[PDB]
Design a protein around this ligand. Structure first.
Ligand code: ZQT
Ligand code: ZQT
Ligand code: TNF
Ligand code: TNF
Ligand code: TNF
Length: 313
C-alpha cells in the first residue's frame, strides 16, 4: 500500500455539540485476537494505524471475519456523530451488474490529524480480563462514512477514461462499492469488468473479484426511509417485506450442522440490502425475527459486508 500525500488531508469535524464515540470492545476468541494482532502489526508498520497513549478515551469496536481473515470495524456510532458532507433507475434493468469493493483506495489517503483520536479502537485481551492494545487510524478507514465522500474527487478522476470509453455501461457508487451494469453478453460484460479492475490497479486501487447480479431477472417509492421486515414462516422458510409493500420475497430456512438462524439472517440482510441499493439506492432499516441478545451475540460470526445497517428486534 503506497505512501500518502500530505496535501490530500481534508479537515473533518464531528457534528456540533457531539463528542466522539465510546462503544466498548466485546470479547473475541483467541483465534480472532491473533488474527487482528497480525493485521494490525502490518498496518502499523505501513503507517496506516498508530498505537495511542493512555489519554485517549474513545472507542469503536472491531472484529475479525474470514482462508484469510479481514478486520471489520463497527463505525456506526462514529458515523452518527460525524458531520454530513443520483441513483439510475435503469440499473435494475441491466442484464448484469457487478459489485466491486473499492475500499482498498482509502489506505492511501491521510485522515485529518485532529480527527484521528475519534477512530480509536482496542484489540481485546483474552476474555477482556486485562487492558487491550489501543490504536487509532492515520488514513481514511473503511466503514467510516467520511471515507467515500473524501475520496470522491479522486475516484471520479480515476473512472473518467473508463466511463468516456464505455457509454453503454452504467457505474453507480454506493458506500464503498461500485455497481457496474450493462446489457452486454456475459463474456463481454466480464471483459469490461476486467478492464476496469486493471485500470483501478494501475492507479493503485486493488479490488477483489466482484459479485455478479442479474437484476433484469428479479421478480410507489418515496425518495424522501426503507424498512425491511423478515419473519419466520414456519420451520422451512423466511419471508420478507420491504416497505415505507414495495417488494416481498422468500428465502429457505434450513437446519443443519453448519447453519443456524443468525447465519441465514445475516445472509438475507446482505442480499436484501444489495437488492435495495440496486433498485432504489437506499439501505433499509431491518426488523429481524430474533431476540436482541441472540443476534447481538452471534451476528459478527458470519457478517461479510464492510457496512453494517441498523436493525431492531
Ligand atoms: O482487513 C485487512 C486484512 C489484512 O490482512 C490487511 C489489512 C486489512 O490492511 C493492511 C494494510 C496495509 O497497509 C498492509 C497490510 O498488509 C494489510 C493487511
Ligand atoms: O462501509 C461503509 C459503512 C457505512 O455505514 C457507510 C459507508 C460505508 O459509506 C457511506 C457513504 C455516505 O456518503 C453516507 C453514509 O451514511 C455512508 C455509511
Ligand atoms: O473496550 N474499550 O472501550 C476500551 C476503552 C479503553 N479506553 O481507554 O477508552 C481502553 O483502555 C480499553 N482497554 O484498554 O481494554 C478498552
Ligand atoms: O481488552 N479489552 O477490550 C477490554 C475491554 C474491557 N471492556 O469492559 O470493554 C475491559 O474492561 C477490559 N479490562 O478490564 O481489562 C479490557
Ligand atoms: O483498563 N481497562 O481495561 C479500561 C477499560 C475501559 N473500557 O471502557 O473498557 C476503559 O474505558 C478504560 N479507560 O478509559 O481507562 C480502561
Amino acid at each position: 500500500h503506497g505512501p500518502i500525500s500530505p496535501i490530500e488531508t481534508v479537515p473533518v469535524k464531528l457534528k456540533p455539540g457531539m463528542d466522539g464515540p465510546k462503544v466498548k470492545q466485546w470479547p473475541l476468541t483467541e483465534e480472532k485476537i491473533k488474527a487482528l494482532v497480525e493485521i494490525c502489526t502490518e498496518m502499523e508498520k505501513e503507517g496506516k494505524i498508530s498505537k495511542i497513549g493512555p489519554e485517549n478515551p474513545y472507542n469503536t469496536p472491531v472484529f475479525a471475519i474470514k482462508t484469510k481473515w479481514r478486520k471489520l470495524v463497527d463505525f456506526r456510532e462514529l458515523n452518527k456523530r460525524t458531520q454530513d458532507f443520483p441513483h439510475p433507475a435503469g440499473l435494475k434493468k441491466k442484464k448484469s451488474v457487478t459489485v466491486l469493493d473499492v475500499g482498498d483506495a482509502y489506505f492511501s489517503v491521510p485522515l485529518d490529524e485532529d480527527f484521528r483520536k475519534y477512530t480509536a479502537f482496542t484489540i481485546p485481551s483474552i476474555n477482556n480480563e486485562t487492558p487491550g492494545i489501543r490504536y487509532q487510524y492515520n488514513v481514511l478507514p473503511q466503514g467510516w462514512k467520511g471515507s467515500p465522500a473524501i475520496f470522491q474527487s479522486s475516484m471520479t478522476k480515476i473512472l473518467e477514461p473508463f466511463k468516456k470509453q464505455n457509454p453503454d455501461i452504467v457505474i453507480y457508487q454506493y458506500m464503498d462499492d461500485l455497481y457496474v451494469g450493462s446489457d452486454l453478453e456475459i463474456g463481454q460484460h466480464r471483459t469490461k469488468i476486467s478492464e476496469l479492475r486493471q485500470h483501478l490497479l494501475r492507479w493503485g486501487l486493488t479490488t477483489p473479484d466482484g459479485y455478479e447480479l442479474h437484476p433484469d431477472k428479479w421478480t410507489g417509492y418515496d425518495p424522501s426511509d426503507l424498512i425491511a421486515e423478515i419473519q419466520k414462516q414456519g420451520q422451512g422458510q423466511w419471508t420478507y417485506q420491504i416497505y415505507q409493500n414495495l417488494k416481498t420475497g422468500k428465502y429457505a430456512r434450513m437446519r443443519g450442522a453448519h447453519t443456524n438462524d443468525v447465519k441465514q439472517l445475516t445472509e438475507a440482510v446482505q442480499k436484501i440490502t444489495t437488492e435495495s441499493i440496486v433498485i432504489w439506492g437506499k439501505t433499509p432499516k431491518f426488523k429481524l425475527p430474533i431476540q436482541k441478545e441472540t443476534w447481538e451475540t452471534w451476528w459478527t460470526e458470519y457478517w461479510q459486508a464492510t457496512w453494517i445497517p441498523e436493525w431492531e428486534f
